[PDB]
């Protein structure tokens, strides 16, 4: 599945580079894309929810209760849309949170 796996990620690796890194200079773009395919060649749902709970708590402690309510209610709005990929996507956002 490896050759097929890389062929399937090729256009998306390009998107990731184009959306994030910048724009012209062919050289840099082919090196970023090779890096993406090479790097990618399980999430614990209880942990994801615990980290989202701790964020809500932290927002409130620092005087941003509205942000806590936002987070809590978006996660409520997400539940009827829950599938096997939802915890992974939130895990990804937790890893990029700032």
């Amino acid at each position: 599945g490896s050759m097929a796996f890389l062929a399937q990620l090729g256009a998306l690796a390009d998107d990731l580079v184009s959306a994030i890194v910048g724009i012209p200079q062919t050289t840099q773009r082919d090196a970023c894309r090779d890096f993406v395919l090479r790097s990618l060649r399980r999430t614990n749902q209880f942990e994801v929810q615990d980290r989202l709970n701790g964020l809500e708590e932290r927002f409130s402690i620092v005087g941003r209760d509205a942000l806590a309510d936002a987070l809590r209610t978006r996660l409520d709005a997400l539940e009827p849309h829950q599938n096997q990929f939802t915890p992974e996507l939130l895990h990804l956002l937790l890893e990029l949170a700032d």
Binding site: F5, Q8, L9, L12, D15, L16, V17, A19, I20, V21, G22, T27, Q28, D30, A31, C32, D34, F35, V36, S39, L40, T43, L55, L67, A70, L71, R74, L75, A77, L78, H81, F85, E88, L89, L90, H91, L92, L93, L94, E95, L96, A97, D98
Partner: protein
């Protein structure tokens, strides 16, 4: 109208703004297609972080280009 996939993605990007992830809807869309084709989200996270530093530091992008050429 099972294309309410647009709504699920809308709520994910709201959470992304709340967490201050610095992803626009387009970049999140790319991530979604990658994870659903079985890319590990931690690895994806690491790739995105590295891509961000590559675009911010010419020295590190050139370091990548040189490894890629050798």
């Amino acid at each position: 109208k099972q294309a309410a996939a647009q709504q699920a993605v809308d709520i994910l990007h709201e959470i992304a703004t709340i967490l201050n992830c610095h992803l626009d809807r387009r970049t999140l869309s790319i991530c979604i297609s990658m994870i659903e084709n079985g890319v590990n989200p931690e690895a994806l996270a690491n790739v995105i972080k590295e891509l961000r530093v590559l675009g911010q530091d010419p020295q590190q992008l050139d370091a990548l280009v040189a490894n890629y050429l050798a």
